[PDB]
Design an enzyme around this catalytic site. Structure first.
Site, PDB file in Angstrom:
ATOM      1  N   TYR A  27       0.762  -1.249   0.000  1.00 22.64           N
ATOM      2  CA  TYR A  27       0.000   0.000   0.000  1.00 22.64           C
ATOM      3  C   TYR A  27       0.788   1.292   0.000  1.00 22.64           C
ATOM      4  O   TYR A  27       0.221   2.356  -0.181  1.00 22.64           O
ATOM      5  CB  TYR A  27      -0.983   0.024   1.187  1.00 22.64           C
ATOM      6  N   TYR A  51      -7.625   9.068   2.794  1.00 18.65           N
ATOM      7  CA  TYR A  51      -7.812   9.831   1.562  1.00 18.65           C
ATOM      8  C   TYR A  51      -9.138   9.408   0.926  1.00 18.65           C
ATOM      9  O   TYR A  51      -9.843  10.220   0.321  1.00 18.65           O
ATOM     10  CB  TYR A  51      -6.670   9.546   0.578  1.00 18.65           C
ATOM     11  N   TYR A  64      -1.368  22.467   2.006  1.00 22.35           N
ATOM     12  CA  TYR A  64      -1.838  22.916   3.307  1.00 22.35           C
ATOM     13  C   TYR A  64      -0.630  23.397   4.109  1.00 22.35           C
ATOM     14  O   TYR A  64       0.520  23.184   3.722  1.00 22.35           O
ATOM     15  CB  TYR A  64      -2.559  21.779   4.045  1.00 22.35           C
ATOM     16  N   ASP A  89      -2.412  12.856   6.660  1.00 19.12           N
ATOM     17  CA  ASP A  89      -0.965  12.760   6.511  1.00 19.12           C
ATOM     18  C   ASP A  89      -0.274  12.743   7.849  1.00 19.12           C
ATOM     19  O   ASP A  89       0.642  11.952   8.074  1.00 19.12           O
ATOM     20  CB  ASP A  89      -0.433  13.947   5.714  1.00 19.12           C
TER      21      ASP A  89
END
Ligand SMILES: O=c1ccc2ccccc2o1
Length: 121
Positions: A27, A51, A64, A89
């Site tokens: 992943y 996500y 961001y 994140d």
């Protein structure tokens, strides 16, 4: 964006996103399928799922801002999408730090066909 995420990773782990976490397990990097290979791969699975909860946002390219208070990652307020991507994140970075002791190089460049089994978010 992948720009802030990679910076978090480096500050937390000391490792570079690419290629330490861009081709790791099932992943980390490809999104993907199969059963997570280990704790670090589980961090990526959950991150992908995070996500996945933001259909109308663009995590890869929406930037961001975040700061560090006492070493702790603090997401600064931006748009709704920006606040939520940052949290996704932030969690993965911490998860990576939490499982550094178990990071294994035999999972780097892991072949796709070895990713079997299923796991819903
Ligand atoms: O899945 C990804 C995510 C980020 C990224 C950045 C540079 C090059 C390739 C990449 O692939």
């Amino acid at each position: 964006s992948l720009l802030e995420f990679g910076k978090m990773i480096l500050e937390e782990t000391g490792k570079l996103a690419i290629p330490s976490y861009s081709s790791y397990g099932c992943y980390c990097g490809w999104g993907g399928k199969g059963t997570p290979k280990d704790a670090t791969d589980r961090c990526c699975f959950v991150h992908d799922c995070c996500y996945g909860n933001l259909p109308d946002c663009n995590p890869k390219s929406d930037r961001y801002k975040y700061k560090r208070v006492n070493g702790a990652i603090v997401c600064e307020k931006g748009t709704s999408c920006e606040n939520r991507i940052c949290e996704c994140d932030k969690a993965a970075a911490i998860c990576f730090r939490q499982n550094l002791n178990t990071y294994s190089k035999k999972y780097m460049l892991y072949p796709d066909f070895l990713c079997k089994g299923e796991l819903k978010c």
